[PDB]
DNA sequence: CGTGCCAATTTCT
DNA sequence: GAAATTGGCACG
């Protein structure tokens, strides 16, 4: 588990945008088919998303770039 | 009631109504109840009364009367700018709530 | 959790389905307020 | 117990919709922070008012 | 009773009109005189209010030490002390019409007691008993640096100290005139006028009296450069403090007591009331040991100053005398100031938290607070 | 005719 | 009960 989110707040910069970014990533992992970028240790989606944010692996720009890449690849594959 | 002997807002009583009925046959209408108030509200012209109140406010000089006049000019302009009408304050049809 | 009649069932179905997401909707006690205000002869309405 | 509740309700209702909506308004007027002195004692130093 | 300094430093005077007396000390002829203590660093550590007509044992910039009485005055006696030296020549006082003859039975130190218009005869009602300072040559000694001679009027119930012709100088009195909690916060935030507010004067300049007993007394103010003809109604049944022989500032009191916030806002500004309120609330909170930051009261004060009254319509669309939001005025004036036109003029308002919250722009947000029927 | 004081009414704990 | 607003009357 975890007790403080100070590192994630420092990396994102705002305490209100961190919630939205973490919710977006956690919803991607939970209801979508995505898999964590960090080794999950009996953790839930929200804590996994926070631990990914803490290490500089997830932010708004990364999520947008990956979504655009996924959309382009899907539209190319469907042909 | 015309500009002959009685004003358009004068209040009468039973004996006074009988006297006025004996005095004037035609051009004289007196009513009581909400129908009278609805007739008063419906025959009122808003633009002309607005102009009259504006000139009476800007010409004469006072402070309390000036506030009293500007307290009514604002209401008249609020009624004119919106789509409401003066006589809609008198209910003719009454809504009833869903059971 | 309190009042939106069509959102309570959707939230319950989503929680049982393992998806934690809500469709907010509109509370059912503001429609009552509108119906009680407009039964006084006052035309209140949502627009646009 | 009740007067404080009424006062805080009025205080909340008068200023419910004040929100930080910018980062710099472009004006540098303001107040002058001087320590409070009733005449004999300095009640609060300037290190706590700024 | 008297000012007793506690530490060692330098004595500083502000807004003081002082003159040396006959004994060599310094007397004060200004009501708004303030005394301050400085240190070698330059900070201020004391702040006392010196009344009108007080004797100072020290002067401005002089050095003192701990536990020294630097000021002393008589509280029950309001002096009419003079600035020039010379004899006294009585002018326009008739016994039985303006003054009265009363003698002390025990001490025997007696003089002519100046009566009041409410008690004296009508003949003396239109006459002003005034004491005139003269010299040995019989002329009138003008106040130094001025033009008007030294004649001082006296109000009713004025006890003349010494008889006519006795040599006097500065420091001698012409006449003697005998004199919280949670609701406090709840009244400070609601901006409620006190029982007997401290009445104020609008504009600066010289001041004088006027018509008497047309309901109450009247005032006359003539600015040195500004227009005079403004006259203020003043109740004379409450003990006044206006010195009708001295120049006054616009931001000064006439009577004394608790001042209403509306008058502070109208006559002194916004940054005056936003310090008065945050000090009067912090005084209540501090004596109980409660620590609250200053931002939290400043935002409430800002929310209280959220309306404006139009004085003239101007080139904008607002009419002559309505009340509108301050932000709308501030944007309508800036859209025209950046343009070639000119905006309108506004007067700031101050409202209570229960009246600035019921005058919002949203009826859903205002019918929830209270008075749903009156709002809908 | 024009101001200001006093009784009534309302709304709020 | 307290406070603010409104209508009625004494007064200049």
Swiss-Prot record, chain A:
Entry coiled-coil feature ranges: none
SMART domains given in the database record: RNA_pol_Rpb6 (SM01409)
Domain of life the protein comes from: Bacteria
GO term, biological process aspect, one: transcription antitermination
This protein's UniProt keywords: DNA-directed RNA polymerase, Nucleotidyltransferase, Transcription, Transferase
EC numbers on record: 2.7.7.6
GO CC annotations on file: cytosol; cytosolic DNA-directed RNA polymerase complex; RNA polymerase complex; transcription elongation factor complex
Family annotation (HAMAP family): RNApol_bact_RpoZ (MF_00366)
Membership in a protein family: Belongs to the RNA polymerase subunit omega family.
Subunit structure: The RNAP catalytic core consists of 2 alpha, 1 beta, 1 beta' and 1 omega subunit. When a sigma factor is associated with the core the holoenzyme is formed, which can initiate transcription. The rRNA transcription and antitermination complex (rrnTAC) consists of RNAP, NusA, NusB, NusE (rpsJ), NusG, SubB, ribosomal protein S4, DNA and precursor rRNA; S4 is more flexible than other subunits.
Name of the protein described by the UniProt record: DNA-directed RNA polymerase subunit omega
Source organism: Escherichia coli (strain K12)
UniProtKB/Swiss-Prot annotation, chain B:
Species: Escherichia coli (strain K12)
Post-translational modification: Acetylated on several lysine residues in the presence of glucose.
Parent-protein start and end of this portion: 149 to 247 of 1407
Biotechnology: Co-administration of salinamide and rifampicin or salinamide and myxopyronin suppresses the emergence of resistance to both antibiotics.
Function summary: DNA-dependent RNA polymerase (RNAP) catalyzes the transcription of DNA into RNA using the four ribonucleoside triphosphates as substrates. Resistance to the antibiotics salinamide A, salinamide B, rifampicin, streptolydigin, CBR703, myxopyronin, and lipiarmycin can result from mutations in this protein.
Phylogenetic lineage: Bacteria, Pseudomonadati, Pseudomonadota, Gammaproteobacteria, Enterobacterales
Family, per entry: Belongs to the RNA polymerase beta' chain family.
Subunit structure: The RNAP catalytic core consists of 2 alpha, 1 beta, 1 beta' and 1 omega subunit. When a sigma factor is associated with the core the holoenzyme is formed, which can initiate transcription. The rRNA transcription and antitermination complex (rrnTAC) consists of RNAP, NusA, NusB, NusE (rpsJ), NusG, SubB, ribosomal protein S4, DNA and precursor rRNA; S4 is more flexible than other subunits.
Protein name: DNA-directed RNA polymerase subunit beta'
Superkingdom classification of source: Bacteria
Swiss-Prot record, chain C:
Biotechnological applications: Co-administration of salinamide and rifampicin or salinamide and myxopyronin suppresses the emergence of resistance to both antibiotics.
Modifications the protein undergoes after translation, according to the UniProt entry: Acetylated on several lysine residues in the presence of glucose.
Family per record: Belongs to the RNA polymerase beta chain family.
Cited function: DNA-dependent RNA polymerase (RNAP) catalyzes the transcription of DNA into RNA using the four ribonucleoside triphosphates as substrates. Resistance to the antibiotics salinamide A, salinamide B, rifampicin, streptolydigin, CBR703, myxopyronin, and lipiarmycin can result from mutations in this protein.
Record's subunit section: The RNAP catalytic core consists of 2 alpha, 1 beta, 1 beta' and 1 omega subunit. When a sigma factor is associated with the core the holoenzyme is formed, which can initiate transcription. The rRNA transcription and antitermination complex (rrnTAC) consists of RNAP, NusA, NusB, NusE (rpsJ), NusG, SubB, ribosomal protein S4, DNA and precursor rRNA; S4 is more flexible than other subunits. In pull-down experiments interacts with CedA.
UniProt name for this protein: DNA-directed RNA polymerase subunit beta
Lineage: Bacteria, Pseudomonadati, Pseudomonadota, Gammaproteobacteria, Enterobacterales
UniProt gene name: rpoB
């Amino acid at each position: 588990a975890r007790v403080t989110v100070q590192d994630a707040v420092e990396k994102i910069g705002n305490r209100f945008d961190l919630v939205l970014v973490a919710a977006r990533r956690a919803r991607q992992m939970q209801v979508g088919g995505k898999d964590p970028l960090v080794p999950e240790e009996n953790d839930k989606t929200t804590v996994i998303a926070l631990r990914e944010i803490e290490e500089g692996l997830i932010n708004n720009q990364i999520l947008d770039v990956r979504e655009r890449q996924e959309q382009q690849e899907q539209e190319a594959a469907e042909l | 009631g015309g500009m002959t002997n009685l004003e358009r807002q004068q209040i009468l009583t039973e004996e006074q109504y009988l006297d006025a009925l004996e005095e004037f046959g035609d051009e004289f209408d007196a009513k009581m109840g909400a129908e009278a108030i609805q007739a008063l509200l419906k025959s009122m012209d808003l633009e002309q009364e607005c102009e009259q109140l504006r000139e009476e406010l800007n010409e004469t000089n006072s402070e309390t009367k000036r506030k009293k006049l500007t307290k009514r000019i604002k209401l008249l302009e609020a009624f004119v700018q919106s789509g409401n009408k003066p006589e809609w304050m008198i209910l003719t049809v009454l809504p009833v709530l869903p059971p | 959790k309190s009042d939106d009649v069509n959102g309570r069932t959707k939230m319950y179905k989503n929680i049982v389905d393992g998806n934690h997401q809500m469709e907010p909707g509109m509370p059912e006690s503001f429609n009552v307020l509108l119906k009680e205000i407009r039964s006084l002869g006052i035309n209140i309405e949502l627009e646009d | 117990t009740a007067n404080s509740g009424y006062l805080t309700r009025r205080l909340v209702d008068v200023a419910q919709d004040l929100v930080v909506t910018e980062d710099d308004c472009g004006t540098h007027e303001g107040i002058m922070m001087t320590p409070v002195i009733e005449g004999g004692d300095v009640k609060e130093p300037l290190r706590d008012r700024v | 009773s008297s000012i007793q300094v506690k530490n060692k430093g330098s004595i500083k005077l502000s807004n003081v009109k002082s003159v040396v007396n006959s004994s060599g000390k310094l007397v004060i002829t200004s009501r708004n005189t303030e005394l301050k203590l400085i240190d070698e660093f330059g900070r201020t550590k004391e702040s006392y209010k010196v009344p009108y007509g007080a004797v100072l044992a020290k002067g401005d910039g002089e050095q003192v030490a701990g536990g020294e009485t630097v000021a002393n005055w008589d509280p029950h006696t309001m002096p009419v002390i003079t600035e020039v030296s010379g004899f006294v020549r009585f002018t326009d006082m008739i016994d039985g019409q303006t003054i009265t003859r009363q003698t002390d039975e025990l001490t025997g130190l007696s003089s002519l007691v100046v009566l009041d218009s409410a008690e004296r005869t009508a003949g003396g009602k239109d006459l002003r008993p005034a004491l005139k300072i003269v010299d040995a040559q019989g002329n009138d000694v003008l106040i130094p640096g001025t033009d008007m001679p030294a004649q001082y009027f006296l109000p009713g119930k004025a006890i003349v100290q010494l008889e006519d012709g006795v040599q006097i100088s500065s420091g001698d009195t012409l006449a003697r005139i005998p004199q919280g909690g949670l609701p406090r916060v709840a009244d400070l935030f609601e901006a409620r006028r006190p029982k007997e507010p401290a009445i104020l004067a609008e504009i600066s300049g010289i001041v004088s009296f006027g018509k008497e007993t047309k309901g109450k007394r009247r005032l006359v103010i003539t600015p040195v450069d500004g227009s005079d003809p403004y006259e203020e109604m003043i109740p004379k049944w409450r003990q006044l403090n206006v010195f009708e022989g001295e120049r006054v500032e616009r931001g000064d009191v006439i009577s004394d007591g608790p001042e209403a916030p509306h008058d502070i806002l109208r006559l002194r500004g916004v940054h005056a009331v936003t310090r008065y309120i945050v000090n009067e609330v912090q005084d209540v909170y501090r004596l109980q040991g409660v620590k609250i930051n200053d931002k939290h009261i400043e935002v409430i004060v800002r929310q209280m100053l959220r309306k404006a009254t139009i004085v003239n319509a101007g080139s904008s669309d607002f009419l002559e005398g309505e009340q509108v939001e301050y932000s709308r005025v501030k944007i309508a004036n800036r859209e025209l100031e950046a343009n070639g036109k000119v905006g309108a003029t506004y007067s700031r308002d101050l409202l209570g938290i229960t009246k600035a919250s019921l005058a919002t722009e949203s009826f859903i947000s205002a019918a929830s607070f209270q008075e749903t029927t009156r709002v809908l």
